[PDB]
Design an enzyme around this catalytic site. Structure first.
Site, PDB file in Angstrom:
ATOM      1  N   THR A   4     -20.745 -32.736  20.371  1.00 23.83           N
ATOM      2  CA  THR A   4     -19.966 -33.259  21.503  1.00 23.83           C
ATOM      3  C   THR A   4     -19.958 -32.255  22.653  1.00 23.83           C
ATOM      4  O   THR A   4     -20.234 -31.070  22.454  1.00 23.83           O
ATOM      5  CB  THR A   4     -18.504 -33.584  21.123  1.00 23.83           C
ATOM      6  N   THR A   5     -19.630 -32.736  23.850  1.00 25.14           N
ATOM      7  CA  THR A   5     -19.672 -31.905  25.054  1.00 25.14           C
ATOM      8  C   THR A   5     -18.451 -30.984  25.121  1.00 25.14           C
ATOM      9  O   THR A   5     -17.320 -31.420  24.901  1.00 25.14           O
ATOM     10  CB  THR A   5     -19.756 -32.760  26.338  1.00 25.14           C
TER      11      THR A   5
END
Ligand SMILES: [Cl-]
Ligand SMILES: [Mg+2]
Ligand SMILES: [Mg+2]
Ligand SMILES: [Mg+2]
Ligand SMILES: [Mg+2]
Lengths: 226, 195, 243, 244, 196, 241, 231, 204, 250
Positions: free
Chosen positions: C30-31
């Site tokens: 995930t970012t």
């Protein structure tokens, strides 16, 4: 033991007496208390003789390997650091009291080293049972910018004070002179003020005086071939 | 343990060892055998600190018996005594030393000679015509110095030993309850059951 | 061939393929981002809501080291935790010996050397995380980003994970439009926006925003989580910008 | 991890052979031939050097024959460096025994110890075995004159005459043909040199290509003497036996 | 031994006598007890000469390695490294060390580390056998934010009295001045300080 | 073909892992240069900050190992920092044990010996870095000593490292062929830095701004790195003649 | 394929195949359900027998008075991890006079599982765990995967056919969270959830295993005729 | 209690013209009790002679240790050890037990086979070397021996004169020590012959 | 982070070859030529200083190394492997000999210790053999002058004269024709320079050649006076000027 060190114009000089005593008896009348560490680094040894000699030889060996590794002539500060760290590790149980002096690329140096691992810097120092006698002479006559001839005189005078006035010290004076830009000169038996006088009688026995039970030849040879 | 004596005669070695085991106030036993057979022609008597004596003796016995099986061969008395000395010499600088004194009596089948070795707890080895440990030598050595001959028979050696034990029984304060006597010769080890 | 089967093996290029494969695990995560502001740093992360059954605000991803350093990472979450556990040990021993809390560049090298050590032997696996971390020390604010190789640099803005290209472009605009700098409260708002914009790469599932910050004026140089009204204000700002 | 690169030196083949032992033996078959012959009044050790060079300093050189103690010697076939590691261990074992028992180590006990060390490398540790075969020539008061051999497997056996290294098949046939039990040292010297002279891969057998030694009871007054032959002495015995 | 360190307006000054004794014999009358662990972090040593030298050498090593990695250490950091060695090895050490240093941020700071291995930050500190005789004098005469000349006089007068009464102290009064300007060594001989 | 994966000999007597570690050296695409003056040793290195998000002050391949010793690295930064930390630890330990500052050539030898171990022992890989150590040694004077992944090291009058090392090396070779001396005959380090930058410009055929370079200077009793404004002053002087 | 021989090796797409194969062992395991309200937390587990002569393998393990788990996958690995949890709970009580937080218990399990995924020689744990507990912040339910990933949830299910139960809990979320101060109704919801994962077999008296922990309820396991009420 | 005087005994060594002499008593005791009159304290390793006084278990142990070491030396060096080299080996070996020493007083005597030079040396229990030109003394009557040697000794004595001098030094020293005596041995050592003589003395 | 190579990397192949030793010998073959010649009153060892760059200072790279005051060494093959062997050889001369016997080891025994270190890299776990052959020249009181070669296997042989590395086959043939047992040291130096000229392509002078001798005692190099028995090192490295003087009489 009386050992001394002092600095002069372009050098440093070490002095030592030549008597080894165990308890009240003189074990050796001509022993060398000035130890070789490197070609231009020397160490006067007091305290337990075996310890002083052993510690100088170990550090002297490690100094030689270091010198080979680094392609540089050894420094007195390296010998000093290695000796004190070793002596500190053993908490005084290695009873070596040392005066270290030498010449290197940095200049001329004089240090003292105690059994527990404390070091001192000085212009003149003395250690051993004769140190107080030796230091009396150094405090009376040491000055700045001494010449070599004056320095050898003062160093031997300091050791002589120990020889005559300390029962722990005796026999001859050993000196080592380390001057800048010159080979160190090791002057063993620099002074000989205690030669024994000729005896009154000759104690050589007539042959056959001793009674003998048995005689035999000892074979000290390798087994022979036929 | 108290008295252990040894005497090497013409053709045998005789070892005499006390029977008493005292624990402070009381004599707990009066028939204790203070000896181990190490090999068929080697006997070791022992005296010293309680527990350590037997532990040491049996440990030596096990090692010599192990050697015998491995090589199918009996070590000479000299070889056994050197092994025992080294173990005691190793012991003296240990954390807790074996306090054990031993006599090793053996008949060397190669040389056809009896041999007696005296080894103290420090690992001090000596080959002797006669020996003892503790205070036993103080009473007996003057008699042995006087009467001993290297060409004595086994019967003459036993008679000289009786005189030594009689002197011990007269002048020693402790009651050691007599001695077990054992003879080591070319035929092996046997016990003299009446002494 | 076979050079990619074992860690610490140089390929004929001079590359360690196992470290490059660890980067693929980071790119799959995930970012997460970091923004350096005037007197501190802001960290933010995208948390994918896999299901309705996830308890909101509970599965906290950002981690504190000591009291003044924040750490966030993308990739294999357990690897990131292991790295932070080490970081906490390094920070504790530094403070034990030297009294002062660990400076951020010093802390960066402690993590860096540790991660780099896991590329030296075939008996270990490289870290499957890129870690964005930083805080405030005696010399001011510092933001770092650390890769699986052990490589790290200082950053004005940093981004990693699946939406990193999107995030980086947004960070580059902020740097150009604010040379004088960005305030701590501004950076929180902008961090929210960037995570929301970066969520187009993970647009299938909905997500939960999580922000933290260290600031000399706003948090006394301590790491704190953005909570309640300040968090909702940042979400509202972010939601307004996407529409 | 590391498993990938492991040759696994201590495993059985499907046929129940130790791969590395068998390959070490193949290595030893290319080494210079060493021969040991046991007689009633002594033992002979003869061995061929593989140096084959004019500039080699022979009088200070030792690749084949080594002294373990005053009573025991070895002839080496295989990797000389490997042999020196084992030789030094055997020298220490002999002195340990002498310190413990105050008697010179019996020959078999020394041989068993070295053979056990070799065995260990074939069963545990994951290391390659020692690529060495020894001929042990020795004397003790139990069994008298003894010849043994050990190989990389750690197996050892006793012999009246034996060869190791190159052309052992051919060498053992020749020894089996001319050996007798009542043989003497001077006869055994001649047999050893004649066997090497026929089995050698060289065009002719010369002093510079040989190492030679005898253990003879017959040191002055009943003592055992080892004699490592000098280059000039090897040259003389070659002329005496009629080979050059 | 008589040692002290005193903070003042421009920084800090360390002061010491030069006597080292083995019982009643003066083994060294020109000892340097002011020792450098970093450029502007020095210490005064009292107790076992072996121990304090061994400690100071280790600290100097730690701060050199600190500097290579993290830049110039604070005086507080130096005091902490000293404390760590003294506290953890309290059973095998006899060391009483005063740590003094100059930062540009913090200015002059003094930390005293007595036998136990505790740390105490102070405006000034006194230690060594001779310090007992000047607790009264130093407490009455110390002021904060003195000038360089006033602080030199304060240390000179203080150690003069410590030397006068303590047999274990004597020789020259050595001093080291730590300021933004740099590092200055001072020495004061018996004929100067005895007549004060 | 596992003789290419670990540090064992190939049939040609080569160590492929060592050779491939040399190739990793040029992965940064940065060129370095070192020269000696009378009283100083200068080291210059290209500085490339490709990302605008990077903090350019933290991007560096020059390290202050000790007070007297500086080190520039050609290779990836993780291995560079591995080598930097170790060299710092080794320099501090030396001073503690032997009572004087570790010489530049002795540190080089020590790090080279460590590198040799990674070429002989299987479990440790070589570091993919070339280390160039610089100082003004108290015995030898201005000193450049360079270490590589093979464990090789040697002293240099001047040296160059990187993708375009041959162009820089030949440029330096030609200068010393004219002057017929082992150094730049110049009093101030400022002018020795100006020489270094000028000869890199000529060799690479590229112009530099203040942010494109990184400079390290060794003098007696200290090694230091120049700021961007110090370098700018250097670049102004070059352009003005 | 070439990258699944050990746990230390990444694949070219950044995957750890040994960890994924360990994850597969959980999918083969028998279904177990976890769910909670604000007051209580419940575990429900379908136990598996070898045959009609055999006993049903126990699925639920007590870790402390306020915490415990259910397992799916390799049972000996659950024994190792539950024993580790017992020790960490016990360490917290003995040293700090403190009951171990459920969230912190999850962090400890995560880190223990992680070490086995980054080192040579070892293997990942081959089991999934559902930890329930009641601590100072109320009821908690955790899901542990042997990759290291630990997740705090209102409800979940793991094992074979667990997707059926997990969908039911996703629908029922708003109802079962509100079941406060009523342990029987919360268990009913868990039993109804696990029934969505059954095929061919149904819940019998020696098949079903239930555990509960809550506000004034120590962690207790119900087996045999104690669960007949809920069938 | 004092380990160096439990067993008793003495060694003396002297130099002469192209020769050395080493001599010892034969007593082994347990304090007051005389145990053995055949405990020789002089050993030899090739042509190097080593006398050892002090604790008897260590005397035996060190003999076995130096036999071990000189045997291995010979096998590796392919030559017998020389007195100067052996002296350093004794010193090294004693000092390695610095903090748990052997309670002994070794004495080395021998002639260097290459130079022909007579050599003697003495040590303390931790390996400090005394390399005397004239004489070395050791044991429980070392004071008495120092007194005899210092008056009786003159340099460059011929082998048969040196025998008389060293014998009379040992005998009269031993007769003033309770823990020494019970027989005596004298070795007269020349470059390639060594004569061993047992002396007749009082047995109290 | 564990060392898992606890197994041998050198093993016997089906033909009885130890592959890694053979490959190490191939690396020695690629190496620059070095030689050794023994005279009646000395030994000479020599090699080419193959400078990797003209900017490099080849004086700082010592191919000929002092091991003890009376023993020197030269090599062919991998330079870094040689350097670490020289370090170990210097230290083992002290630890396993000088600290025990109070004197430096004889040539053959120091060689034996180096040989042992090289053998162990051929059998121990997780290591490759050393990729060097050494030529060790030395003097000691009882053995006199001697010259030894040491190979990657750990094997060593004594030589009257020999060569190793690049042009060793041609060089050994050259030395066989010239060597006799009546050579003085100056004759051996002359032959060494003649032999070495054949294998050198480029410049041939004192700056590109490294040459040392084991000869007479040098009391001038000792550094101190006052102990008659210490007369100074027999090892001496010839200067650049000393080599160029002998190249005029060539
Ligand atoms: Cl090294
Ligand atoms: Mg006073
Ligand atoms: Mg490697
Ligand atoms: Mg008497
Ligand atoms: Mg009497």
């Amino acid at each position: 033991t009386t050992i001394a060190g002092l600095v002069f114009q372009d050098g440093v000089i070490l002095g030592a007496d030549t008597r080894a005593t165990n308890d009240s008896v003189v074990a050796d009348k001509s022993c060398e208390k000035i130890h070789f560490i490197a070609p231009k680094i020397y160490c006067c040894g007091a305290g337990v003789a075996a310890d002083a000699e052993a510690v100088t030889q170990l550090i002297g060996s490690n100094i030689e390997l270091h010198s080979l590794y680094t392609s540089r002539e050894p420094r007195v500060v390296s010998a000093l650091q290695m000796l004190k760290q070793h002596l500190f590790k053993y908490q005084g149980h290695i009873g070596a009291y040392l005066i270290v002096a030498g010449v290197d690329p940095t200049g001329s140096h004089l240090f003292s080293i105690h059994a527990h691992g404390s070091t001192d810097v000085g212009y003149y120092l003395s250690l051993g049972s004769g140190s107080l006698a030796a230091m009396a002479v150094l405090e009376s006559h040491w000055k700045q910018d001494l010449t070599k001839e004056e320095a050898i005189k003062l160093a031997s005078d300091a050791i002589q004070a120990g020889i005559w006035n300390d029962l722990g010290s005796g026999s001859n004076v050993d000196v080592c002179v380390m001057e800048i830009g010159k080979d160190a000169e090791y002057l063993r038996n620099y002074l000989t003020p205690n030669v024994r006088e000729e005896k009154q009688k000759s104690y050589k026995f007539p042959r056959g005086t001793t009674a003998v039970l048995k005689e035999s030849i000892v074979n000290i040879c390798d087994i022979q071939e036929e | 343990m108290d008295i252990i004596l040894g005497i090497r005669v013409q053709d045998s070695v005789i070892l005499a060892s006390s029977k008493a085991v005292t624990r402070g106030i009381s004599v707990l036993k009066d028939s204790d055998d203070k000896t181990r057979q190490l090999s068929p022609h080697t006997l070791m008597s022992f005296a010293g600190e309680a527990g350590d004596t037997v532990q040491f003796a049996e440990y030596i016995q096990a090692n010599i018996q192990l050697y015998s099986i491995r090589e199918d061969y009996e070590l000479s008395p000299q070889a056994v005594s050197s092994f025992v000395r080294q173990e005691l010499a190793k012991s003296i600088r240990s954390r807790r030393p074996y306090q054990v004194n031993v006599l090793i009596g053996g008949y060397d089948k190669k040389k056809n000679k009896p041999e007696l070795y005296q080894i103290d707890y420090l690992g001090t080895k000596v080959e002797l015509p006669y020996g003892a440990h503790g205070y036993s030598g103080f009473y007996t050595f003057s008699l042995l110095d006087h009467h001993y001959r290297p060409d004595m028979t086994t019967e003459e050696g036993l008679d000289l030993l009786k005189l030594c034990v009689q002197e011990l029984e007269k002048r020693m304060p402790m009651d050691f309850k007599g001695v077990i006597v054992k003879i080591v010769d070319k035929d092996g080890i046997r016990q003299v059951d009446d002494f | 061939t076979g050079y990619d089967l074992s860690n610490s093996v140089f390929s004929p290029d001079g590359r360690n393929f196992q470290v490059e494969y660890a980067v693929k695990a980071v790119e799959n995560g995930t970012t997460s981002i970091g923004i350096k502001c005037n007197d501190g740093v802001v960290f933010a992360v995208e948390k994918l809501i896999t299901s309705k059954l996830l308890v909101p605000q509970k599965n906290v991803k950002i981690q504190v080291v000591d009291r003044h350093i924040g750490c966030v990472y993308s990739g294999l979450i357990p690897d990131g935790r292991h790295l932070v556990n080490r970081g906490r040990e390094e920070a504790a021993s530094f403070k034990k010996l030297y009294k002062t809390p660990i400076p951020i560049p010093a802390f960066a090298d402690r993590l860096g050397q540790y991660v780099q050590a896991h590329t030296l032997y075939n008996s270990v696996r490289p870290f499957g995380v890129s870690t964005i971390f930083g805080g405030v020390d005696k010399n001011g604010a510092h933001l770092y980003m650390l890769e699986p190789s052990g490589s790290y640099w200082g950053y004005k803005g940093a981004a990693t994970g699946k939406g990193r290209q999107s995030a980086k472009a947004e960070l580059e605009k902020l740097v150009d439009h604010h040379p004088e700098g960005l305030s701590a409260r501004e950076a929180v708002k902008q961090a929210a926006k960037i995570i929301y914009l970066a969520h187009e790469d993970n647009k299938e599932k909905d997500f939960e925003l999580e922000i933290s910050w260290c600031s000399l004026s706003e948090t006394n140089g301590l790491h704190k989580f953005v909570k309640g009204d300040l968090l909702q204000e940042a979400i509202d700002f972010a939601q307004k910008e996407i529409n | 991890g590391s498993r990938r690169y492991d040759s696994r030196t201590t495993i059985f083949s499907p046929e129940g052979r130790l791969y590395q032992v068998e390959y070490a033996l193949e290595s030893i078959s290319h080494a210079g031939t060493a021969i040991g012959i046991m007689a009633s009044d002594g033992i002979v050790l003869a061995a061929e050097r593989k140096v084959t060079s004019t500039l080699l300093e022979q009088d200070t050189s030792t690749e084949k024959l080594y002294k373990l103690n005053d009573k025991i010697a070895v002839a080496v076939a295989g990797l000389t460096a490997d042999a020196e590691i084992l030789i030094n261990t055997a020298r220490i074992h002999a002195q340990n025994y002498l310190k413990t028992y105050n008697e010179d180590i019996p020959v078999e006990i020394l041989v068993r110890r070295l053979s056990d060390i070799k065995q260990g490398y074939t069963q545990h540790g994951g290391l390659r075995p020692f690529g060495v075969s020894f001929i042990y020539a020795g004397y003790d008061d139990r069994y008298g004159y003894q010849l043994y051999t050990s190989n990389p497997s750690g197996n050892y056996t006793g012999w009246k005459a034996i060869s190791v290294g190159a052309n052992t098949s051919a060498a053992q046939t020749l020894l089996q043909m001319d050996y007798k039990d009542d043989m003497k040292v001077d006869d055994a010297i001649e047999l050893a040199l004649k066997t090497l002279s026929k089995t050698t891969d060289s065009s002719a057998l010369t002093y510079d290509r040989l190492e030679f030694a005898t253990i003879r009871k017959g040191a002055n007054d009943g003592e055992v003497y080892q004699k490592i032959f000098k280059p000039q002495e090897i040259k003389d015995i070659l002329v005496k036996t009629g080979i050059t | 031994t008589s040692i002290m360190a005193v903070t003042f307006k421009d920084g800090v000054i360390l002061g010491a006598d030069s006597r080292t004794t083995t019982g009643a014999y003066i083994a060294n009358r020109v000892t340097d007890k002011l020792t450098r662990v970093h450029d502007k972090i020095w210490c005064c040593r009292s107790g076992s000469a072996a121990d304090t030298q061994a400690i100071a050498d280790i600290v100097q090593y730690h701060l050199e390695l600190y500097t290579s990695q993290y830049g110039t250490p604070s005086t507080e950091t130096a005091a902490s490294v000293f404390k760590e060695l003294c506290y953890e090895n309290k059973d095998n050490l006899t060391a009483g060390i005063i740590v003094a240093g100059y930062d540009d941020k913090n200015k002059g700071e003094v930390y005293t580390i007595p036998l136990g291995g505790s740390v105490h930050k102070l405006p000034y500190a006194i230690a060594g056998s001779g310090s007992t005789f000047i607790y009264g004098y130093c407490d009455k005469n110390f002021r904060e934010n003195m000038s360089k000349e006033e602080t030199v006089d304060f240390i000179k007068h203080s150690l003069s009295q410590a030397i006068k009464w303590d047999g274990s102290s004597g020789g020259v009064i050595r001093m080291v001045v730590l300021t933004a300007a740099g590092v200055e060594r001072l020495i004061f001989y018996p004929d100067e300080y005895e007549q004060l | 073909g596992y003789d290419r994966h670990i540090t064992i000999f190939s049939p040609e007597g080569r160590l492929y892992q060592v050779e491939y570690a040399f190739k990793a050296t040029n992965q940064t695409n940065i060129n370095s240069l070192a020269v000696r003056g009378k009283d100083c040793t200068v080291v210059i290195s290209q500085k490339k900050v490709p990302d605008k998000l990077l903090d350019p002050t933290t991007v560096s391949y020059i390290f202050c190992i000790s007070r007297t010793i500086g080190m520039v690295v050609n290779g990836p930064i993780p291995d560079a920092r591995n080598a930097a930390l170790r060299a710092k630890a080794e320099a501090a330990e030396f001073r503690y044990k032997y009572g004087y500052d570790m010489p530049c050539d002795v540190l080089a030898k020590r790090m080279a010996n460590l590198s040799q171990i990674y070429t002989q022992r299987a479990y440790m890989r070589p570091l993919g870095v070339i280390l160039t150590f610089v100082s003004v040694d108290e015995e030898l004077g201005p000193s450049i000593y360079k270490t590589d992944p093979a464990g090789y090291y040697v002293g240099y009058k001047a040296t160059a490292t990187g993708p375009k090392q041959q162009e820089i090396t030949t440029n330096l070779e030609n200068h010393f062929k004219k002057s017929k001396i082992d150094h730049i005959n110049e009093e101030s380090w400022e002018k020795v830095v100006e020489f270094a930058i000028t000869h890199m410009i000529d060799a690479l055929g590229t112009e530099f701004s203040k942010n494109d370079l990184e400079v390290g200077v060794a003098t007696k009793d200290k090694f230091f790195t120049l700021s961007a404004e110090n370098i700018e002053e250097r670049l102004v002087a070059i352009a003005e003649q | 394929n070439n990258y699944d021989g050990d746990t230390v090796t990444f694949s070219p797409t950044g995957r750890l195949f040994q960890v994924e194969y360990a994850l597969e062992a959980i999918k083969q395991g028998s279904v177990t359900v976890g769910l909670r309200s604000n007051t209580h937390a419940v575990l429900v587990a379908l136990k598996r027998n070898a045959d009609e002569l055999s006993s049903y393998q126990k699925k639920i393990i007590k870790c402390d008075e306020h915490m415990g788990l259910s397992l799916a996958g390799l049972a000996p690995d659950a024994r190792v991890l539950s024993n580790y949890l017992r020790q960490q709970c016990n360490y917290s009580s003995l040293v700090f006079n403190r009951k171990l937080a459920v969230e912190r218990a999850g962090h400890l399990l995560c880190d223990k599982a992680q070490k086995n995924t980054q080192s040579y020689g070892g293997r990942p744990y081959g089991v999934g765990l559902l930890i329930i507990g009641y601590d100072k912040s109320g009821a908690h339910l955790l899901e542990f995967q042997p990759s290291g990933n630990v997740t705090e949830l209102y409800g979940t299910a793991i094992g074979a056919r667990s997707q059926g139960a997990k969908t039911y809990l996703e629908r029922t979320l708003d109802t079962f969270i509100k079941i406060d101060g009523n342990p029987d109704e919360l268990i009913k919801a868990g039993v109804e959830a696990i029934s969505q994962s059954l095929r061919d077999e149904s819940l019998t008296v020696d098949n079903l295993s239930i555990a509960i922990v809550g506000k004034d309820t120590p962690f207790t396991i119900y087996d045999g005729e104690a669960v007949a009420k809920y069938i | 209690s004092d380990p160096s005087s439990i067993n008793g005994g003495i060694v003396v060594a002297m130099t002469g013209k192209d020769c050395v002499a080493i001599a010892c008593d034969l007593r082994l005791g347990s304090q007051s009790l005389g145990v053995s009159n055949k405990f020789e304290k002089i050993f030899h390793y090739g042509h190097v002679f080593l006398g050892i006084t002090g604790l008897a278990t260590d005397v035996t142990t060190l003999n076995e240790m130096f036999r071990y070491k000189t045997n291995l030396y010979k096998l590796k060096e392919e030559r017998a050890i020389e007195p100067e080299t052996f002296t350093q080996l004794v010193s090294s070996s004693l000092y390695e037990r610095r903090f748990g020493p052997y309670f002994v007083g070794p004495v080395v005597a021998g002639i260097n086979s290459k130079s022909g030079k007579p050599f003697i040396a003495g040590f303390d229990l931790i390996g400090c070397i005394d390399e005397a030109k004239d004489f070395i003394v050791s044991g429980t009557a070392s004071d008495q021996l120092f007194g005899m040697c210092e008056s009786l000794y003159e340099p460059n004595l011929e082998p048969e004169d040196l025998f008389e001098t060293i014998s009379q030094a040992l005998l009269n020293a031993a007769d003033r020590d309770a823990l020494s005596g019970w027989g005596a041995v004298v070795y007269i050592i020349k470059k390639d012959e060594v004569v061993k003589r047992y002396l007749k003395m009082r047995q109290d | 982070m564990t060392d898992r190579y606890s197994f041998s990397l050198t093993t016997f192949s089906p033909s009885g070859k130890l592959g890694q030793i053979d490959y190490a010998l191939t690396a020695v073959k690629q190496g620059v030529t070095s030689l050794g010649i023994k005279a009646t009153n000395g030994v000479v060892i020599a090699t080419e200083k193959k400078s990797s760059s003209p900017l490099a200072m080849s004086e700082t790279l010592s191919k000929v190394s002092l091991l003890t005051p009376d023993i020197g060494a030269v090599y062919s093959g991998m330079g870094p492997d040689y350097r670490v062997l020289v370090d170990k050889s210097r230290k083992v001369a002290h630890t396993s000999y000088k600290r025990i016997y109070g004197e430096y080891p004889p040539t053959k025994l120091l060689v034996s210790e180096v040989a042992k270190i090289m053998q162990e890299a051929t059998q121990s776990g997780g290591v490759r053999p050393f990729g060097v052959s050494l030529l060790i020249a030395g003097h000691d009181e009882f053995n006199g002058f001697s010259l030894y070669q040491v190979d990657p296997s750990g094997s060593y042989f004594p030589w009257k004269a020999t060569a190793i590395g690049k042009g060793s086959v041609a060089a050994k043939t050259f030395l066989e024709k010239r060597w006799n047992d009546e050579l003085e040291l100056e004759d051996a130096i002359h032959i060494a320079l003649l032999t070495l000229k054949e294998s050198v392509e480029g410049e041939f002078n004192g700056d590109t050649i490294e040459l040392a001798i084991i000869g007479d005692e040098n009391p001038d190099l000792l550094g101190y006076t006052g102990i008659p028995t210490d007369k100074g090192p027999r090892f001496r490295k010839l200067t650049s000027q000393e080599i160029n003087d002998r190249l005029e009489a060539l």
